[PDB]
């Protein structure tokens, strides 16, 4: 059962790697907008949590 479960673990590992790469790539792009919206445009006006 543990060997069979180590196979599910490995599937999860590969999935996790893929998701990791995708998340980092998203952040890299979003950084530019953050530096660009330092004009005090973001604090409340743009970031409407509602």
């Amino acid at each position: 059962e543990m060997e069979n479960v180590q196979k599910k673990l490995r599937k999860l590992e590969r999935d996790y790697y893929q998701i990791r790469e995708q998340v980092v790539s998203a952040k890299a792009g979003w950084c530019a907008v953050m530096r660009m919206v330092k004009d005090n445009g973001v604090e409340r006006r743009l970031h409407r949590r509602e």
């Binding site: 990791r20 790469e21 998340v23 980092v24 952040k27 890299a28 950084c31 530019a32 953050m34 530096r35």
Partner: protein, 72 residues
């Protein structure tokens, strides 16, 4: 090199200047990276050097000097 690849990751994951990121520059107060920003920073540090870090030992890292210390 590792000691400048760390800067490569930190500057482009927090968007702060290369000059700002010194060895002792803490992420939260100096670089301004908050909870999710620091999470993404540690994830990027993991990806750059294709390694993995424990949860507690990773969260212990809260500075450029500490970042390199765990990296190197």
């Amino acid at each position: 090199t590792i000691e400048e690849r760390v800067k490569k990751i930190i500057g482009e994951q927090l968007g702060v200047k290369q000059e700002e990121v010194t060895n002792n520059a803490s992420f939260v107060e100096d670089l301004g990276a908050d909870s999710l920003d620091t999470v993404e920073l540690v994830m990027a540090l993991e990806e750059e050097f294709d390694t993995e870090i424990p949860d507690e030992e990773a969260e212990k890292i809260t500075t450029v000097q500490a970042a390199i210390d765990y990296i190197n």
